[PDB]
Structure formats: C-alpha cells, structure tokens
C-alpha cells in the first residue's frame, strides 16, 4: 500500500 514501509 502506498506510503507504507
């Protein structure tokens, strides 16, 4: 998911 590390 975008923005997750």
């Amino acid at each position, epitope marked *: *998911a*975008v*923005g*997750l*590390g």
Partner: antibody
Amino acid sequence: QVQLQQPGAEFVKPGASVRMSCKASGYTFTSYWIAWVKQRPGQGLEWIGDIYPGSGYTNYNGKLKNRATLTVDTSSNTAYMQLSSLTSEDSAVYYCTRGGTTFVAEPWLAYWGQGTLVAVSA
Amino acid sequence: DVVMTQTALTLSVTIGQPASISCKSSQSLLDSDGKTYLNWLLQRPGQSPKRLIYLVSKLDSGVPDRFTGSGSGTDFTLKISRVEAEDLGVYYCWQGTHFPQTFGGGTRLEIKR
C-alpha cells in the same frame, strides 16, 4: 478539526516557476503524507506527487520530468509544491490532500484543501 | 501503472430511484496484507473532491446509508439505493494498493429529463 488551507489562485508567466502552499492544522503534521493532485478544467484527477513531512521523503509522477519539487516546513505545518518552466498545459487546479501514515494506509484522501487555481499567462 | 476504468462516463439518474456505477482495474487491488485499498470520491460542482468510501465497502463519517460499495479483485461497484440531489456530480475511484496511486476517469451523475 483537520483542515488544509490553500491560497485561492496564483498567476505565473510562461517559463517561470510557481510556488504553492498547503497549511495543515488539527493533527500531528509530521505523521501523515501530503499528496498533490492536479485537475485540468474539464478533466479528471491526477496524482503529481507526495511528501512525508516527518522526513521530507518525496515521490513524483514521471510525467512532470523532474519539474516538480515538494518540500515541507515543519515549523509552520506547511507543505509546498514548486513547478518550474510552466507552459499552458500546467494551467489547472492543484489540490492539497492528506494521505495515511507510514503504518496505516486507511486515511488516504480523507481530507482535501479547497485547491489553488494556477493560470499560466504572459 | 494500474489502469482504473469507470463505466458509465455519464449516468442519467432520477431522484428517488437507484443508481449503480462500476470501477474496473487492470490489476488485482488486493494488497499482501489482506486489505484492498479502493476509495470512492464525489466531486460536486465547484467543490473539492470528497471521500465517501474507503476500503472497498467502508462508509466515511456522515455518509448516508444509501451509499454502498462492493466488489473484489479487479471489479468494484458503487450503488445508491435512492438518489438525492446532493449526490449529483462526478464520482472517482482511486487505488492505493500499487505504486503509483491511480485515479479512475470519473463517472458523472446528471438528472434525466
């Protein structure tokens, strides 16, 4: 309450640069991504890029070809977008929107600014 | 990138009657953590986009029960049981499962006459 405040309009000449601001309030500024979304007058929404205010980590859309630069000022809770070498194809409304955190993606696009109209003209 | 196709470029609706629009993606939106990051937004004329549904079927604070999101994998639908005047505008689907994030082209709801 969570709010993102944007100037109403910016006027810029062709070949020049513009700088737009998004002042955040009502939450921990450094914990949520800030995304920038472009909308041409009769068209749909396009992601331009986003920035994580905690570190200043940036993502850009390839279609700008390294003309957009995103920054944050943690002391004023303000995110900035700069666009260089403007042509008429950059005439559009640019929206501030708040993303998720680095741990949860659920809040993505939950809050929007009122948008900044950018008109490119000599 | 992930292509999001919105079906019904324009849907002519009647107040008090149902409406249904669909969003198809060129890839599965199911993320490795089990969730599907599909949002629906409404942009009323002159307004900023507003989020109605996240996480294919979850309603945002204040969104009336008449809205229902559904779907799985690549095929998703937004439904309104009875359309009201405040529902007219352009509806956008969005995906945050795959980088880069993408928006659908949009479906406009307008009054039939």
